[PDB]
């Protein structure tokens, strides 16, 4: 006795149902101390107004020392509330909002199943254990005491974020690194982003918390391979002030940033960078500038990467003016480099004086160096350079002035694609990939009825234009869409042969060989796996069913052809499962999609690059 949460749920319901009906609840009426809420799905016992944007709030309630555990307060918004001494461990709080509240001495280690990320506005979290991924842009920090780091049955030591406790791992496994540091693999959710989110004013409680973390890494062993998956994630946050002014963070970052750069010069010097989204534009471009700044040699001997980085800094819509200025500056270097000097001509380049005219994109503002003959060069304008980089169905190529070295050299006898060959590898890749993005483009239309589901027919194509998609297709209106779209494309489980017939022809290869045919639509499966995984159309624990159906359909119809190309009879079964839930329900299909593609780039990798959007490679 007394009774279950089923009691308190009903009690709460009315309290707010009346609170919203106008009644200014007595304090006694809204005192819910020691309230049992475990396994309560508030979504099922409150009106929808309480979990929508506009928002009905839960104001003035006192849940001091209460139990939510396996509870679900996702999308709810608590205001002027006291949780002090309450546990919230294993609570699914997808996008929950706590404001003007007292959440002190609470155990806020919410369920990993949480999607969005809880946020705390003008709320205190004194001596409380939180997961290292809350939105704390409105959190109140007060000088810490001493007390005791909780703890319980978990893992490693604790560090303070002001008066907030955060729990380190027991040991930096590859998985530890991922859940903690890799916000790029987890829709912007890492311990990095978390402590970086505090108001630009708590700037020593932060630098502190980083330094502390950084230590627990310095104290870990972390082979140059543990940190490779996150070189970017890390450098996205700590290669910026206020962290640039530690000594630790600054010193520890050193190698990591160098490794970052080098890796980029290898990967993207002969190859197009996916048109930078708003994060890349704000957190990566600055860093590449810094690295080019500190390595003036690279500006020339990685002309490929450099130019790209500049164009993008100066075209990106979300680029801090600082970036735009530093990028303009660094180009002035380049443009005065003795390797480049000769190619620049007053009355020809940029503003006819010797610099670019950054005021009009029609201006011949770029001079790329050849990767073979340092004395041959291409001059072209911001507009044409953007389209040659991330092309379009009908993007012209023959649209530049060749310089050697010496004035304009006549085209109309030069095959631009044989020019890109060794002189300008970037465009080769762009042109080459544009050809492969067209066939796969056809399939997208064969299955999303040209202009019916025309909204989704485009959402799908847009996702192929870089590694991470901010938009996700998992709801109720969204799950219905695709199950009505793929269901008929696969009568009773497998691959409708009248559709295997479509995709026979529309990849310019009906009859060839089962060994190649298997590899072909295997890749197509690792393509649709990627579609349904995290980082694209699903979150780390919720992948579109139908997209996993179509994906499983494809590798099943790859097993009958040449199963000898696969890894094992264990793997097909191991994978073909996953697409259905016999195997947990987390790390998404980001394992299936990642591993299937990994077993491609080895054993038969030529086919991976002909179907697989460049951005997903």
UniProtKB/Swiss-Prot annotation:
One GO-annotated biological process of the protein? protein ubiquitination
Q: How is it modified after translation?
A: Ubiquitinated in the presence of host E1 ubiquitin-activating enzyme, E2 ubiquitin-conjugating enzyme and ubiquitin.
Q: What class of enzyme is it?
A: transferase
TM segment ranges = none
Disulfide bonds, paired cysteine numbers: none
Q: Which GO terms describe its molecular function?
A: ubiquitin-protein transferase activity
Q: Does the keyword Secreted apply?
A: yes
Q: Which keywords fit this entry according to its UniProt record? A: Secreted, Transferase, Ubl conjugation, Ubl conjugation pathway, Virulence
| Record field: catalytic activity | S-ubiquitinyl-[E2 ubiquitin-conjugating enzyme]-L-cysteine + [acceptor protein]-L-lysine = [E2 ubiquitin-conjugating enzyme]-L-cysteine + N(6)-ubiquitinyl-[acceptor protein]-L-lysine
Q: What's the Enzyme Commission number for this chain?
A: 2.3.2.26
This protein's source sits in the domain of life called Bacteria
In this protein, the active site sits at 588
Coiled-coil region list: none
Per the record's keyword annotation, is Ubl conjugation included, yes or no?
yes
Q: What else is known?
A: Requires SpaK/InvB as a chaperone for its stability and for secretion.
Q: How does it assemble?
A: Interacts with SpaK/InvB.
* Family under the similarity heading: Belongs to the SopA E3 ligase family.
The record's function comment reads: Effector proteins function to alter host cell physiology and promote bacterial survival in host tissues. This protein is an E3 ubiquitin ligase that interferes with host's ubiquitination pathway. For instance, prevents host innate immune response by ubiquitinating and thus sending to degradation host E3 ubiquitin ligases TRIM56 and TRIM65. Required for inducing polymorphonuclear leukocytes migration across the intestinal epithelium. Preferentially uses host UBE2D1 (UBCH5A), UBE2D2 (UBCH5B) and UBE2L3 (UBCH7) as E2 ubiquitin-conjugating enzymes.
For domains, the record's comment is: The N-terminal 45 amino acids are necessary and sufficient for secretion and translocation into host cells. This N-terminal region binds the SpaK/InvB chaperone. Contains a C-terminal HECT-like domain.
> What is the protein named?
E3 ubiquitin-protein ligase SopA
What species is given as this protein's source?
A: Salmonella typhimurium (strain LT2 / SGSC1412 / ATCC 700720)
**Which span of the parent protein is shown here?**
166 to 782 of 782
């Amino acid at each position: 006795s007394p009774s279950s949460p089923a009691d308190w749920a009903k009690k709460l319901t009315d309290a707010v149902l009346r609170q919203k009906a106008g009644e200014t609840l007595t304090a006694a009426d809204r005192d819910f101390s020691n309230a049992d809420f475990r396994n309560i799905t508030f979504s099922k016992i409150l009106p929808p107004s309480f979990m929508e944007r506009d928002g009905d709030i839960i104001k003035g309630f006192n849940f001091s020392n209460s139990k939510f555990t396996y509870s679900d307060i996702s999308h709810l918004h608590f205001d002027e509330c006291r949780f002090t001494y309450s546990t919230l461990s294993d609570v699914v709080c997808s996008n929950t909002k706590f404001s003007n509240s007292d959440m002190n001495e609470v155990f806020l280690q919410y369920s990993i199943t949480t999607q969005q990320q809880p946020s705390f506005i003008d709320t205190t979290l004194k001596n409380t254990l939180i997961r290292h991924k809350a939105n704390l842009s409105g959190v109140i920090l007060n000088e810490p005491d001493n007390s005791s780091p909780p703890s319980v049955s978990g893992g490693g030591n604790f560090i303070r974020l002001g008066d907030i406790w955060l729990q380190m791992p027991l040991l930096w496994t590859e998985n530890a690194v991922d859940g903690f540091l890799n916000h790029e693999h987890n829709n912007g959710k890492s311990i990095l982003m978390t402590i970086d989110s505090l108001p630009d004013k708590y700037s020593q409680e932060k630098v502190q918390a980083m330094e502390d973390l950084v230590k627990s890494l310095r104290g870990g062993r972390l082979t140059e391979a543990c940190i490779r998956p996150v070189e970017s994630s890390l450098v996205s946050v700590l290669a910026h002030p206020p962290y640039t002014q530690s000594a630790l963070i600054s010193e520890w970052l050193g190698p990591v940033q160098e490794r970052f750069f080098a890796h980029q010069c290898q990967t993207y010097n002969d190859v197009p960078l996916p048109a930078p989204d708003t994060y890349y534009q704000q957190r990566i471009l600055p860093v590449l500038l810094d690295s080019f700044d500190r390595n003036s040699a690279a500006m020339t001997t990685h002309s490929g990467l450099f130019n790209q980085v500049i164009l993008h800094c100066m075209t990106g819509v979300d680029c801090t003016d600082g970036t735009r200025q530093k990028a303009a500056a660094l180009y002035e270097q380049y443009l005065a480099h003795p390797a480049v000097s000769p190619h620049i001509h007053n009355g020809l380049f940029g503003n006819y004086d010797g610099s670019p005219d950054w005021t009009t994109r029609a201006a011949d503002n770029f001079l790329l160096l050849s990767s073979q003959d340092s004395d041959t060069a291409m001059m072209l304008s911001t507009d044409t350079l953007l389209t040659m980089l991330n092309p379009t169905p009908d993007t012209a190529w023959d649209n530049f002035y060749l310089l050697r070295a010496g004035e304009n050299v006549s085209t109309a006898q030069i095959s631009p694609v044989e020019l890109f060959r060794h002189d300008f590898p970037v465009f080769l890749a762009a042109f080459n990939q544009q050809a492969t993005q067209r066939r796969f483009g056809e399939l997208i239309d064969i299955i999303l009825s040209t202009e019916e589901h025309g909204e989704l027919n485009q959402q799908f194509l847009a996702a192929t234009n870089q590694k991470h998609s901010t938009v996700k297709l998992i709801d109720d209106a969204s799950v219905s869409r695709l199950a009505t779209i793929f269901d008929p494309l696969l009568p009773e489980g497998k691959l409708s042969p009248a559709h295997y017939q479509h995709i026979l022809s529309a990849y310019h290869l009906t009859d060839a060989t089962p060994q190649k045919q298997a590899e072909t639509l295997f890749c197509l499966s690792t393509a649709f796996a990627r579609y349904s995984s995290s980082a694209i159309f699903g979150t780390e624990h919720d992948s579109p069913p139908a997209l996993r159906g179509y994906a499983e359909a494809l590798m099943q119809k790859a097993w009958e052809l040449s199963p000898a190309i696969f890894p094992s009879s264990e793997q097909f079964t191991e994978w073909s499962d996953r697409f259905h839930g016999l195997h947990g329900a987390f790390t998404c299909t980001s394992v299936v999609a990642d591993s299937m593609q990994r077993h491609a780039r080895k054993y038969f990798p030529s086919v991976l690059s002909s179907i697989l959007p460049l951005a997903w490679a």
